[PDB]
Enzyme design. Structure first.
Site, short mmCIF file in Angstrom:
data_model
loop_
_atom_site.label_atom_id
_atom_site.label_comp_id
_atom_site.label_asym_id
_atom_site.label_seq_id
_atom_site.Cartn_x
_atom_site.Cartn_y
_atom_site.Cartn_z
N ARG A 2 81.09 39.78 31.69
CA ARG A 2 81.00 40.98 30.87
C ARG A 2 80.41 42.03 31.80
O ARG A 2 79.23 41.95 32.16
CB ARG A 2 80.09 40.75 29.66
CG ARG A 2 79.93 41.96 28.73
CD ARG A 2 78.92 42.98 29.25
NE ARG A 2 78.57 43.97 28.23
CZ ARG A 2 77.64 44.91 28.38
NH1 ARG A 2 76.95 45.01 29.51
NH2 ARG A 2 77.40 45.76 27.39
N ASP A 40 78.92 45.49 32.86
CA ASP A 40 78.09 46.55 32.28
C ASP A 40 78.48 47.95 32.76
O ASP A 40 78.79 48.15 33.93
CB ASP A 40 76.63 46.29 32.64
CG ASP A 40 75.69 47.26 31.98
OD1 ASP A 40 75.54 47.17 30.75
OD2 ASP A 40 75.09 48.11 32.67
N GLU A 56 82.09 47.11 29.46
CA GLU A 56 81.55 47.94 28.39
C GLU A 56 81.89 49.40 28.67
O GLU A 56 81.39 50.00 29.62
CB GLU A 56 80.02 47.79 28.30
CG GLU A 56 79.41 48.74 27.28
CD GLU A 56 78.05 49.25 27.71
OE1 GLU A 56 77.85 49.45 28.93
OE2 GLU A 56 77.19 49.48 26.83
N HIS A 92 73.61 45.19 21.04
CA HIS A 92 72.25 45.58 21.40
C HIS A 92 72.03 47.07 21.61
O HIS A 92 70.89 47.51 21.81
CB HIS A 92 71.82 44.83 22.66
CG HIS A 92 72.75 45.04 23.82
ND1 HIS A 92 74.04 44.57 23.82
CD2 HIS A 92 72.58 45.68 25.00
CE1 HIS A 92 74.63 44.91 24.96
NE2 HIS A 92 73.76 45.59 25.69
N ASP A 93 73.11 47.85 21.56
CA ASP A 93 73.00 49.30 21.74
C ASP A 93 73.38 50.06 20.48
O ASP A 93 73.61 51.27 20.52
CB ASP A 93 73.88 49.77 22.90
CG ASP A 93 73.47 49.16 24.23
OD1 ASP A 93 72.26 49.17 24.55
OD2 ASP A 93 74.36 48.67 24.96
O1 LIG Z 1 72.27 52.35 27.74
C1 LIG Z 1 72.96 52.71 26.55
C2 LIG Z 1 74.39 53.11 26.84
O2 LIG Z 1 74.38 54.49 27.26
C3 LIG Z 1 75.67 55.06 27.45
O3 LIG Z 1 76.41 55.11 26.26
C4 LIG Z 1 76.56 56.44 25.71
C5 LIG Z 1 78.02 56.87 25.78
O4 LIG Z 1 78.46 56.89 27.13
C6 LIG Z 1 78.17 58.25 25.15
O5 LIG Z 1 79.55 58.62 25.12
C7 LIG Z 1 77.60 58.26 23.73
O6 LIG Z 1 78.35 57.43 22.92
O7 LIG Z 1 76.24 57.80 23.72
C8 LIG Z 1 76.10 56.46 24.25
C9 LIG Z 1 74.65 56.05 24.08
O8 LIG Z 1 74.52 54.64 24.04
C10 LIG Z 1 76.45 54.28 28.52
O9 LIG Z 1 77.78 54.77 28.57
C11 LIG Z 1 76.48 52.78 28.20
O10 LIG Z 1 77.04 52.07 29.30
C12 LIG Z 1 75.06 52.26 27.92
O11 LIG Z 1 75.12 50.91 27.48
O1 LIG Z 2 66.71 51.50 31.63
C1 LIG Z 2 67.72 52.16 30.88
C2 LIG Z 2 68.30 51.26 29.82
O2 LIG Z 2 68.73 50.05 30.48
C3 LIG Z 2 69.34 49.09 29.62
O3 LIG Z 2 70.47 49.59 28.99
C4 LIG Z 2 71.69 48.93 29.34
C5 LIG Z 2 72.48 48.64 28.06
O4 LIG Z 2 71.78 47.70 27.26
C6 LIG Z 2 73.86 48.11 28.42
O5 LIG Z 2 74.63 47.87 27.25
C7 LIG Z 2 74.53 49.19 29.26
O6 LIG Z 2 75.83 48.85 29.54
O7 LIG Z 2 73.82 49.34 30.50
C8 LIG Z 2 72.48 49.84 30.31
C9 LIG Z 2 71.85 49.90 31.68
O8 LIG Z 2 71.80 48.61 32.27
C10 LIG Z 2 68.35 48.63 28.55
O9 LIG Z 2 68.98 47.71 27.68
C11 LIG Z 2 67.85 49.84 27.76
O10 LIG Z 2 66.85 49.42 26.85
C12 LIG Z 2 67.29 50.92 28.71
O11 LIG Z 2 66.98 52.09 27.97
#
Ligand SMILES: OC[C@H]1O[C@H](O[C@H]2[C@H](O)[C@@H](O)[C@@H](O)O[C@@H]2CO)[C@H](O)[C@@H](O)[C@@H]1O
Ligand SMILES: OC[C@H]1O[C@H](O[C@H]2[C@H](O)[C@@H](O)[C@H](O)O[C@@H]2CO)[C@H](O)[C@@H](O)[C@@H]1O
Ligand SMILES: OC[C@H]1O[C@H](O[C@H]2[C@H](O)[C@@H](O)[C@@H](O[C@H]3[C@H](O)[C@@H](O)[C@H](O)O[C@@H]3CO)O[C@@H]2CO)[C@H](O)[C@@H](O)[C@@H]1O
Ligand SMILES: OC[C@H]1O[C@H](O[C@H]2[C@H](O)[C@@H](O)[C@@H](O[C@H]3[C@H](O)[C@@H](O)[C@H](O)O[C@@H]3CO)O[C@@H]2CO)[C@H](O)[C@@H](O)[C@@H]1O
Ligand SMILES: OC[C@H]1O[C@H](O[C@H]2[C@H](O)[C@@H](O)[C@@H](O)O[C@@H]2CO)[C@H](O)[C@@H](O)[C@@H]1O
Ligand code: GLC
Ligand code: CA
Ligand code: CA
Ligand code: CA
EC number: 2.4.1.19
Length: 686
Positions: free
Chosen positions: A227, A229, A257, A327-328
């Site tokens: 998967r 990131d 992702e 988780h997001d």
């Molecule tokens: O770390 C959380 C998350 O942040 C970003 O996601 C953004 C996304 O790109 C925006 O288009 C909008 O939807 O807000 C999101 C907030 O989560 C990163 O793109 C993502 O990889 C990451 O997991």
């Molecule tokens: O330190 C910044 C954030 O890092 C992680 O966020 C991940 C997220 O969970 C994952 O889905 C995305 O694709 O990548 C980011 C960066 O690795 C932590 O999980 C967050 O708590 C932090 O804010």
């Protein structure tokens, strides 16, 4: 082995993934728990380590929690060593319990366990027919401050203990120093830092070679999938070269992702899933499911549109990993919400196309807002919740009913609140009826299906108020009442007489690599496999059985080919398109073209003498190229996966829609490096 075997690393469509946040699942070994301010054994402080580890996962695999649920695959936290720093963000301590702050991709995170523990995890999972997917985040290392190196670990990167460099005084250019992204464009979110995370520079040969060597280590440890990131934040071209490295060595199912918001449909997203060598987490599916079943911001017509649209937009929609939360995102189940909403969303996801992924604890009705409130320790391991039973009854269907794993999707009945859809593959059918209206039943008359006439019991056994279906002549169902909040599943399975391809993987690799063709009706004796018009039979077909074929890619010219098979008798199957034969091993090369002026809406693209560059076909040119961050207009740049050590002629194009303007003069030329990266910088020729 059959397509459904745990040994099938190329196909997860017959599986159900359980997404485990290691630290919050089960602490099987208290001895490896972090200590002091970085730990909270009660898991009250959701920003510190709680203790969950690999031994805990092994225990839950062995005591039946996952097996009893029908889970056949697990997606675990990034396993690599993370920083040990406790970061203070405005008076609040934060740790790397999540595993996304890597410091050494060639070592394990001691909190999760040792290399040996990882090997035992792979062993235990496989013994119970559970595949193992690891998160892998090569976009960055960890939080860093350029002018304050004392912050965290300065995003320092190590190579199995040996320090490569940090964010401060980065004379090697291991990282990007273009500030932070404001998410205004793909280019901006790719070449600038994601938040304060040190952005790795994949154009740096050290970083490139390092990460590819790293994934190989994990592949050698026996992982079944990856998967990826933040794939929306790394060069798409470099990622293609990364997938090539994986596929030309030991291919495993990989999905990235690419976050999408509510109502967002991205052409760039579709193109990435269709041409990168990896599929994606289906945010389009997830967001629409939440709108329809959770937030009431769209109805079944919107759900139908998403299903039909995605089936058309994704070349391999069956490789997209579906989910209802993660988780997001805020937990799908709201504390004060009717649990049937979650139960229906699960039933819908488990019976829909793609690869279903369930966020840990969903089956226990966990509720929680955004990070970190959505990452609480799982409160129970009860098999008695209705949600657990829903998964238990439907997850196994992806193994026993190929219509659910590989079938087409067709709407058979619909109104604002009701959707009845049918999955079909060979002599297999599945019909699912869902009425999201919790206060009003629906009268279903006029429903027609591909189910043979007869009586069909709800696979859910009425758990979600489903009913028995009576099918008459021509597949027409007798009138019936679909209860309020009703959800029912009816099915038909039988041996398929004709060769039918349901899945192929990997979908991109060089000649000589073995691909896996899964489906039904292939027969027991070796037949023939076709790559376009080219026929492959005999020795290069390593193995052949009714549901699975293992065959080596023929030495045909690089390009896109349709896959088809024919049984021993000569009967041909359906065509599975979009297979890309690479021209050889791949390297990531940055192309830069100077002074290429354009008008608004017009963009520069790259074309050339190899399939990786579209073989001079403008419709297949690389781009649109970038011109903001690393280089500024009128200069353009782009990172591209090209065949290693090959001499390639190329030219740039200016395109608006399908209208194209070619560079004048003779073709540019260069020879790609044998390994590592390179930058080719030329001027636009009028
Ligand atoms: O770390 C959380 C998350 O942040 C970003 O996601 C953004 C996304 O790109 C925006 O288009 C909008 O939807 O807000 C999101 C907030 O989560 C990163 O793109 C993502 O990889 C990451 O997991
Ligand atoms: O330190 C910044 C954030 O890092 C992680 O966020 C991940 C997220 O969970 C994952 O889905 C995305 O694709 O990548 C980011 C960066 O690795 C932590 O999980 C967050 O708590 C932090 O804010
Ligand atoms: O950055 C992505 C965009 O790149 C391209 O836009 C180019 C234009 O093609 C180029 O003419 C120039 O645009 C200027 C524009 O003509 C002028 O009217 C305005 O006042 O200033 C613009 C400069 O910002 O430069 C941009 C690049 O910044 C591409 O055409 C476009 O579709 C992409 O979105
Ligand atoms: O089709 C494969 C060939 O693609 C490329 O050729 C390009 C030229 O690079 C480009 O200049 C343009 O050529 C036209 C030329 O500018 C014009 O004066 C003449 O009248 O017509 C030419 C086209 O017939 O377009 C061609 C593609 O059509 C590539 O350079 C070449 O090596 C490939 O063989
Ligand atoms: O009978 C064939 C017909 O079935 C479905 O139509 C439903 C419709 O979706 C309901 O909203 C309601 O109007 O009853 C109809 C059946 O009588 C399919 O949607 C339709 O495409 C199909 O032709
Ligand atoms: O608007 C932010 C988010 O709010 C809710 O969590 C919705 O369920 C989700 O789909 C949306 O993205
Ligand atoms: Ca522990
Ligand atoms: Ca990046
Ligand atoms: Ca296809």
């Amino acid at each position: 082995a059959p397509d459904t075997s745990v040994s099938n690393k190329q196909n997860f469509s017959t599986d159900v993934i359980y997404q485990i946040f290691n630290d919050r699942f089960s602490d099987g070994n208290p001895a490896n728990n972090p200590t002091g301010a970085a730990f909270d054994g009660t898991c009250t402080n959701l920003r510190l380590y709680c203790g969950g580890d690999w031994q805990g996962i092994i225990n839950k695999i062995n005591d039946g929690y996952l097996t009893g649920m029908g889970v056949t695959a697990i997606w675990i936290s990034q396993p690599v060593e993370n920083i040990y720093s406790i970061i203070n963000y405005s008076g609040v301590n934060n740790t790397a319990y999540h595993g996304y702050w890597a410091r050494d991709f060639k070592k394990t995170n001691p909190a999760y366990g040792t290399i040996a523990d990882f090997q035992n995890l792979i062993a235990a999972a496989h013994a119970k027919n559970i595949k193992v997917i690891i998160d892998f985040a090569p976009n960055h290392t960890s939080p860093a401050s350029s002018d304050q190196p004392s912050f965290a670990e300065n995003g320092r990167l190590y190579d199995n203990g040996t320090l490569l460099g940090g964010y401060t005084n980065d004379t090697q250019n291991l990282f990007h120093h273009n500030g932070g992204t404001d998410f205004s464009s793909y280019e901006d979110g790719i070449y600038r830092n994601l938040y304060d995370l040190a952005d790795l520079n994949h154009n740096n040969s050290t970083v490139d070679v390092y990460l590819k060597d790293a994934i190989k280590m994990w592949l050698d440890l026996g992982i079944d999938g990856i998967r990826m990131d933040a794939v929306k934040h790394m060069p798409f071209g470099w990622q293609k070269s990364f997938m090539a490295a994986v596929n030309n060595y030991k291919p495993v199912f990989t999905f990235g992702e690419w976050f999408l918001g509510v109502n967002e449909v991205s052409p760039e997203n579709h193109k990435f899933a269709n041409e990168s060598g990896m599929s994606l987490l289906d945010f389009r599916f997830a967001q629409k499911v939440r709108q329809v079943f959770r937030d009431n911001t769209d109805n079944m017509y919107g759900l139908k549109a998403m299903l039909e649209g995605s089936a058309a937009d994704y070349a391999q929609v069956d490789d997209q990993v579906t989910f209802i939360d993660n988780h997001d995102m805020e937990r799908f189940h709201a504390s004060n919400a009717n649990r049937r909403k979650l139960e229906q969303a699960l039933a819908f996801t488990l019976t829909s196309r793609g690869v279903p992924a369930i966020y840990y604890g969903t089956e226990q009705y966990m509720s929680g807002g955004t990070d970190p409130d959505n990452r609480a320790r799982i409160p129970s391991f009860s098999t008695s919740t209705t949600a657990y039973q829903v998964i238990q009854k439907l997850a196994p269907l992806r193994k026993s009913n190929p219509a659910i794993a590989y079938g087409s999707t067709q709407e058979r009945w619909i109104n604002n609140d009701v959707l009845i859809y049918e999955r079909k593959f060979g002599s297999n059918v599945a019909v699912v009826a869902v009425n999201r209206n919790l206060n009003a039943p629906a009268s279903i008359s006029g429903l027609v299906t591909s189910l043979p006439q007869g009586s069909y019991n709800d696979v859910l056994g009425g758990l979600l108020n489903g009913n028995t279906l009576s099918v008459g002549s021509g597949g027409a169902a007798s009138n019936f009442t679909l209860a309020a909040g009703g959800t029912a599943v009816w099915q038909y399975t039988a041996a398929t007489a004709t060769p039918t391809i349901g899945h192929v993987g990997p979908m991109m690799a060089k000649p000589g690599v073995t691909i896996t063709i899964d489906g039904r009706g292939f027969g027991s004796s070796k037949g023939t496999v076709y790559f376009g018009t080219t026929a492959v039979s005999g020795a290069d077909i390593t193995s052949w059985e009714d549901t699975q074929i293992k065959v080596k890619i023929p030495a045909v010219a690089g390009g896109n080919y349709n896959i088809k098979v024919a049984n021993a008798a000569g009967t041909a199957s359906n065509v599975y398109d979009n297979f890309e034969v690479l021209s050889g091993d791949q390297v990531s090369v940055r192309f830069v073209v100077n002074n290429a002026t354009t008008a608004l809406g017009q963009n520069v693209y790259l074309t050339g003498s190899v399939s990786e560059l579209g073989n001079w076909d403008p419709a297949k040119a690389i781009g649109p190229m970038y011109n903001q961050v690393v280089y500024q207009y009128p200069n353009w740049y782009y990172d591209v996966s090209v065949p290693a050590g090959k001499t390639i002629e190329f030219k740039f194009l200016k395109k608006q829609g399908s209208t194209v303007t070619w560079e004048g003069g003779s073709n540019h030329t260069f020879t790609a490096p044998s390994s590592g990266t390179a930058t080719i910088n030329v001027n636009w020729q009028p």
